[PDB]
Amino acid sequence: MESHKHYTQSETEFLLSCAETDENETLDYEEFVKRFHEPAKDIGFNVAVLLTNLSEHMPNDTRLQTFLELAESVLNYFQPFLGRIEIMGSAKRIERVYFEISESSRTQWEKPQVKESKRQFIFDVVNEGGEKEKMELFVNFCEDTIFEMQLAAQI
Amino acid sequence: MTVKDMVLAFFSSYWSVFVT
């Protein structure tokens, strides 16, 4: 953990003091990480989405920009994890809602079958698709895609 | 024997349209 040159002296000494060292000088890193990283991931995701909302809804703020300068170190980890669903919420208001994206969800989306089905969908919707049902069939395609994605996930 | 009976057998089905 000192050869990757990522953890400084203080971080190295902290991670060594945070070890189990239950008289045997041995640590089960499985439970160690599942204890010290699983809730850390969720709370870091929450702080990251908070900071992203603040940055996108309060620009030109140097008092916040200097805070972002120290926050990118943890904000970069959750970049392929925060979505931007620009919805129409309150009357005449484009609200940017965020949510969590599971690693399996972003893994089963890059499969060739789903990509080819999406390509064919875009094709036969741009060509012969209507206007009254464009979103209606987009949501039907979305439901079919997620169903086949769970099916390919439980196999 | 198929050079002549094919057209006759093909038209023998349209008798149900000729009756109506």
Added chain:
Amino acid sequence: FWKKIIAYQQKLLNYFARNFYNMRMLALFVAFAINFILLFYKVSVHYVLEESSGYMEPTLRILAILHTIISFFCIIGYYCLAVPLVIFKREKEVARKLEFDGLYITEQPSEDDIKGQWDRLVINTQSFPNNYWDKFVKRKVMDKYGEFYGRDRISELLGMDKAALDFSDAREKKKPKKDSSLSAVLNSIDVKYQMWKLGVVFTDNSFLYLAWYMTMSVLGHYNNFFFAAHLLDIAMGFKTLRTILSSVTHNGKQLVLTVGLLAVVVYLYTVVAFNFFRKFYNKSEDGDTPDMKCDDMLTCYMFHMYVGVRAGGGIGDEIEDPAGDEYEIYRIIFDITFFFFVIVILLAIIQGLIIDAFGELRDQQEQVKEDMETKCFICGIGNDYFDTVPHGFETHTLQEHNLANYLFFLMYLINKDETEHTGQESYVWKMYQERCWEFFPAGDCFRKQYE
């Protein structure tokens, strides 16, 4: 016992589903090998394989056996990889139709569709929404059509009538513990739903294609020549030749009208020849052996359709020299008009129906590419507007309007909770439950909303 065999059959089914295309390509290669070794036949009324120093006669039989076996493997892996998805779509469509339109309630289907009539013996079964990740569709439809119609008149054709009565009765102090007897689950499984499921599968085109595949592979054992029909699987199964075959199968009807017009014109030419050119159709061999004449209408029509179309130079090159009087000019008009009207402007129509289709498919592809590259799929603003910030449109389609992000958001809303949603999540969930989709950005975005 039961657990150790179920956990094994599930793994076997998962293996067959994961390796569907691999076994498909392997069966294709086996058919290729069979048809290549079919290139070594001879005759002796008796078909004989006498062309090598052995090792070719028994290998054909073992390859045919292996091909039939692997085709059976494909027919059992398709039923485990693709059939759940099609039944999910069928259940989804029939359930939404029932809930939001009252199909089998107020707008009974007509006779011009088999799906609306075949989806009738599935709404009254016990496990109707087997693959819809919810079963509260019957509850929705009686609550929607319970007071406007007979409360019991709805549950009589939606099933569970006596079941719902017994459940409302058992809510009191009357409830036993149901027993589970091994080797006696045939009564527990729903037979009507399974019958409907097989009826849906036997209609699925992609399943009938494999069924025909199985028929030809089985007949290949009675005769070792039906394995040639398996080369059509390189086109009807793998979509690697669609760009080419979509040039002939795009028009369709136009081709049948062309074959239905060329034949009429050839029939007119045939009757004209029968009425005015008796002394010409004299295809005698060695002399004084008149044959292939015009003494019969059907024979003359067949002669025309078989020789004059394929002659490449009209019909005047397969008939006698038009030197006879009173016909020297009429037969010249006949032959040259046949040439100009049959193999010039009626094959040009077919050749333009084949050449225009390439352009039509290419134009469709370019239009699709332009609409996905010049507009956004969700908001549809345009590519030029987003190209004001350096490299704006691709960042817009990768962060703000990613279709994948919308898919994960829908999954998250469905799988998260019901009472833990925030304001926006509950708002979107209420619209999704009511199926309106005005929460999609119609013609505005976060960049057009602000500076």
Added chain:
Amino acid sequence: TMSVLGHYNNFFFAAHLLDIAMGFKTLRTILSSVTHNGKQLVLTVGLLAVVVYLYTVVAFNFFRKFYNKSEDGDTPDMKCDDMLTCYMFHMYVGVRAGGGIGDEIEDPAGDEYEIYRIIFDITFFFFVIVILLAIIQGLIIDAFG
């Protein structure tokens, strides 16, 4: 290599005329009509051959008494007594015949086959030299556009 081999034999200097195309780009506007598609052409040659093989096996199974290209009589040759020979005969004569394959074979006057062989020949004509050469000709005409 070709210029050196031209000394061992004075005919490899004919391969140097390909330099008017592969070296000088004065013929690219024309040659870019055939070399633009590429794969499509190989799929076409890989489909036409399959269709001709189907027609060949059909003929081998139902039209024995027709492939009788005898000269002077009583000299049977170029028959269908071999799969490879029949396949070669098809690929060499029926494709280039310009009128299908029914103009290089016997008259289909035999009973029980008078109609089946008519379908065979006319379908070969319409499917081999009509809609499989049209694909190649459209692959060449569309490339100019």
Added chain:
Amino acid sequence: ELRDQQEQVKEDMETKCFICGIGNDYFDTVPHGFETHTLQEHNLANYL
């Protein structure tokens, strides 16, 4: 030429109104605007 004529006719009836001739893009600011415009405001049947 005939295919181009058909596509031009379809585009002019689908991108513009027959009576006013404003355009399809302008009416696509209200959700599903153009078809409602051609079925309520500028219906040829209504004029007849």
